Design a protein around this motif. Sequence first.
Motif, PDB file in Angstrom:
ATOM      1  N   UNK A 105      30.164  41.606  30.147  1.00 23.13           N
ATOM      2  CA  UNK A 105      30.934  40.408  30.481  1.00 23.13           C
ATOM      3  C   UNK A 105      32.395  40.523  30.053  1.00 23.13           C
ATOM      4  N   UNK A 106      32.915  41.743  30.082  1.00 28.79           N
ATOM      5  CA  UNK A 106      34.297  42.001  29.697  1.00 28.79           C
ATOM      6  C   UNK A 106      35.102  42.472  30.894  1.00 28.79           C
ATOM      7  N   UNK A 107      36.439  42.470  30.782  1.00 29.25           N
ATOM      8  CA  UNK A 107      37.311  42.904  31.878  1.00 29.25           C
ATOM      9  C   UNK A 107      37.076  44.345  32.330  1.00 29.25           C
TER      10      UNK A 107
ATOM     11  N   UNK B 136      41.245  46.439  21.192  1.00 25.49           N
ATOM     12  CA  UNK B 136      40.704  46.269  19.849  1.00 25.49           C
ATOM     13  C   UNK B 136      39.473  45.368  19.937  1.00 25.49           C
ATOM     14  N   UNK B 137      38.747  45.237  18.834  1.00 24.04           N
ATOM     15  CA  UNK B 137      37.569  44.386  18.831  1.00 24.04           C
ATOM     16  C   UNK B 137      37.942  42.933  19.074  1.00 24.04           C
ATOM     17  N   UNK B 138      39.065  42.502  18.506  1.00 25.10           N
ATOM     18  CA  UNK B 138      39.493  41.128  18.694  1.00 25.10           C
ATOM     19  C   UNK B 138      39.871  40.863  20.147  1.00 25.10           C
ATOM     20  N   UNK B 139      40.593  41.799  20.764  1.00 21.52           N
ATOM     21  CA  UNK B 139      40.991  41.654  22.166  1.00 21.52           C
ATOM     22  C   UNK B 139      39.751  41.518  23.040  1.00 21.52           C
ATOM     23  N   UNK B 140      38.799  42.415  22.832  1.00 26.12           N
ATOM     24  CA  UNK B 140      37.575  42.391  23.601  1.00 26.12           C
ATOM     25  C   UNK B 140      36.861  41.064  23.444  1.00 26.12           C
ATOM     26  N   UNK B 141      36.779  40.569  22.212  1.00 21.50           N
ATOM     27  CA  UNK B 141      36.100  39.301  21.952  1.00 21.50           C
ATOM     28  C   UNK B 141      36.785  38.096  22.579  1.00 21.50           C
ATOM     29  N   UNK B 142      38.109  38.029  22.479  1.00 21.08           N
ATOM     30  CA  UNK B 142      38.854  36.914  23.049  1.00 21.08           C
ATOM     31  C   UNK B 142      39.109  37.080  24.544  1.00 21.08           C
ATOM     32  N   UNK B 144      36.335  38.248  26.514  1.00 21.28           N
ATOM     33  CA  UNK B 144      35.017  38.186  27.127  1.00 21.28           C
ATOM     34  C   UNK B 144      34.977  36.974  28.047  1.00 21.28           C
ATOM     35  N   UNK B 145      34.227  37.074  29.134  1.00 26.33           N
ATOM     36  CA  UNK B 145      34.127  35.952  30.062  1.00 26.33           C
ATOM     37  C   UNK B 145      32.770  35.268  29.944  1.00 26.33           C
ATOM     38  N   UNK B 174      43.896  38.087  36.250  1.00 28.07           N
ATOM     39  CA  UNK B 174      44.397  38.335  34.903  1.00 28.07           C
ATOM     40  C   UNK B 174      43.208  38.484  33.953  1.00 28.07           C
ATOM     41  N   UNK B 175      42.305  37.512  34.006  1.00 29.05           N
ATOM     42  CA  UNK B 175      41.132  37.514  33.140  1.00 29.05           C
ATOM     43  C   UNK B 175      40.166  38.659  33.433  1.00 29.05           C
TER      44      UNK B 175
END
Lengths: 237, 236
Positions: A105-107, B136-142, B144-145, B174-175
């Motif tokens: 569920x990621x880009x 980064x882990x934070x980027x991936x987490x924030x 996520x859809x 973008x998302x």
Amino acid sequence: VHRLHVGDAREVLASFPEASVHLVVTSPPYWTHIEDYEAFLDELDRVWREVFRLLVPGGRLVIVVGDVAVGRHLVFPLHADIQVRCRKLGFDNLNPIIWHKHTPYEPGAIIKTEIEYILMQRKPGGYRKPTQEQREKSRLPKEDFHRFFRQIWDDIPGEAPFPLELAERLVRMFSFVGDVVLDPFAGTGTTLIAAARWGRRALGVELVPRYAQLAKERFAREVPGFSLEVLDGATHP
Amino acid sequence: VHRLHVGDAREVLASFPEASVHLVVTSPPYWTLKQLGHIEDYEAFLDELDRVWREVFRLLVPGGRLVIVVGDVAVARRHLVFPLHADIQVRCRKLGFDNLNPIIWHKHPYEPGAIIKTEIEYILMQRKPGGYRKPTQEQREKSRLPKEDFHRFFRQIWDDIPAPFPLELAERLVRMFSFVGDVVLDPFAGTGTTLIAAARWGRRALGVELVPRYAQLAKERFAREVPGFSLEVLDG
């Protein structure tokens, strides 16, 4: 008479009189790096050239193409390469019809292929002129017209490169009863069958004699009252 | 710092460092067909676009992509449609881009031969090979859809979004193809729809626009659409 010639598409087509074909519906034989790709495109172009010559002014070449997604993932834009090259050949590009084949569920996720492109390439030179009975016998009921003449078809699932129904719809939309419908890469004859079932004259070319034989058997199975004549090229016994 | 630069897309992009942009969402400027001279001006237009796509390829980080929302140019007096999306895809291949499946944007005498009205636009996907950035882990987490969104976005045909493209169309892209903190560029910013969508979701907006009057309009909607934030407009 519905005929299927066995041989090389370019060579066989080159042996037919100009402006003798009204509509062409077909799918490039892809099962047949950029080099292989370019050479393949060039092969198709020699076929499109003959089609342009065989087509009567106003007639069109309809090509059902799905883009080929074969160190990383990418897709060869087959339909786009075809559209572009057809212009170089003199064809007027018309809007294609989108065949909606297949409805973490990621880009960055990959989007699975759900469509194929139905390219419409018209030979300029003036409009078409059918007989009154041709118009009367080919006129589409309001219901079908609105269902067929739209840019996206999502009511014909995949599973021959395309269903008979998809071919029948094209024949009914871009030819008149009595017209000549050609498929340069007939395979098992889906297009020939669609043409004959709707009162159009079927004309085709197939490379593999095995498939042409399957075509003849299938045709006689799907086309009540008619038979597909298979001509293994030089038929001089 | 979200920035919109005024000037020639080509020249402006040509002033930016290589691999400094993670994603490009844009629509090519409007082109109106105004014996074969027409196709000559058409292919001249393409030639100009290629000059921009070539810079984008340099600016893109490996793995990044160039997303182009294109509708084909229909002209029926003699009816005829210019296959813009097709020409762009083929030309981008020559530029070294990897072509991916495009997303179809479904925007909109009963006798044979009728003309089918245009109902769609193509969202082309051109990826720069060579590898890809590791968020980064934070980027991936924030980034996520939510499940429902993911399944609504990653599909080949979008028919739930009726200029140019709506801000919602830009937000999805973008998302879908960048992470928070990433740089999102639009070399034909217009009134900044892509810039707004980017800034709205924690991405850094970068844009280039030809008409200062439009760059001005953009900054103004930006301030309205992105509360608390501002879009810096430069003239070069």
